[PDB]
Every structure is written in structure tokens, then in C-alpha cells.
């Protein structure tokens, strides 16, 4: 089984793929997902979203050793995207970027596993 250090490297690879990704315009897809919305500016968000999460939290979990599997990080990516697609609307940039983050994450997860299988 993967050591904590080996797992950390894998999770860091997955996170980096998300945070460096750009749209055609050159804008970072991850920009609005790094930190949760301000509680002062978005009290509606916190009334609506049961378990908020951002990339800062996910990064902290990677650094602290709180994930014990890749699947555990995947569940948090699912949550991140689901929340964004609940608060914002289909066709909005945040909604689109949430789906983009999910695609980037799952593609990289598949690639990492594929390499492990030979």
C-alpha cells in the first residue's frame, strides 16, 4: 500500500492539475474555488449550501495527511462541484468551471492509475 509520502505526491499531482488549468481566455478555472465566498458578502450561500468546501481546505488536508486514499479526495472534488452547481446556475461561468474542474480531476486520476497498472 502507498506510504503517506507516496500518497501525498499523488494527491499533490491531482491538485496541481486543477489549480494550473486555464480556460481559452487564459483565466484560471480554479480562481473562484480557492477560497469559500465571504460570509459577510454571501450569507445566502451559507443558508443554501450544507457542507461548503474550497481548494484551500482540500490543499490543507493534503498537507496535514488527513486523506488516506485518492477516493477520499475524489469525494471532496464531487462535493466542491455539486455545491457550485447548486448555488450558481446552468450556463454560468462558475457552473461551467465546476464541471471543468471535475473533468480535469477525473482525467488526471485515471491517467495516474493507468500508469500504475503497467
Curated annotation (Swiss-Prot):
Outcome when changing residue 27 to C: Found in a endometrial cancer cell line
Effect of residue 53 to V: Found in a breast cancer cell line
Transmembrane segments: none
Tissue expression remark: Widely expressed.
Result when mutating residue 51 to G: Found in hematopoietic and lymphoid cancer cell lines
Coiled coil (UniProt feature): none
Chain residue numbers at which the record places covalent cross-link Glycyl lysine isopeptide (Lys-Gly) (interchain with G-Cter in SUMO2): 35
Location in or out of the cell: Nucleus
Resulting phenotype, residue 31 to K: Found in hematopoietic and lymphoid cancer cell lines
Ranges for domain Bromo: 2-112
Residues bearing the modification Phosphoserine: 3
Clinical note on disease: Renal cell carcinoma: Renal cell carcinoma is a heterogeneous group of sporadic or hereditary carcinoma derived from cells of the proximal renal tubular epithelium. It is subclassified into clear cell renal carcinoma (non-papillary carcinoma), papillary renal cell carcinoma, chromophobe renal cell carcinoma, collecting duct carcinoma with medullary carcinoma of the kidney, and unclassified renal cell carcinoma. Clear cell renal cell carcinoma is the most common subtype.
Biological role: Involved in transcriptional activation and repression of select genes by chromatin remodeling (alteration of DNA-nucleosome topology). Required for the stability of the SWI/SNF chromatin remodeling complex SWI/SNF-B (PBAF). Acts as a negative regulator of cell proliferation.
Subunit record text: Component of the SWI/SNF-B (PBAF) chromatin remodeling complex, at least composed of SMARCA4/BRG1, SMARCB1/BAF47/SNF5, ACTL6A/BAF53A or ACTL6B/BAF53B, SMARCE1/BAF57, SMARCD1/BAF60A, SMARCD2/BAF60B, perhaps SMARCD3/BAF60C, SMARCC1/BAF155, SMARCC2/BAF170, PBRM1/BAF180, ARID2/BAF200 and actin. Interacts with PHF10/BAF45A. Interacts with acetylated 'Lys-14' of histone H3 (H3K14ac), and may also interact with other acetylated or methylated Lys residues on histone H3.
Name of the protein described by the UniProt record: Protein polybromo-1
Gene: PBRM1
Complete-protein stretch covered: 176 to 293 of 1689
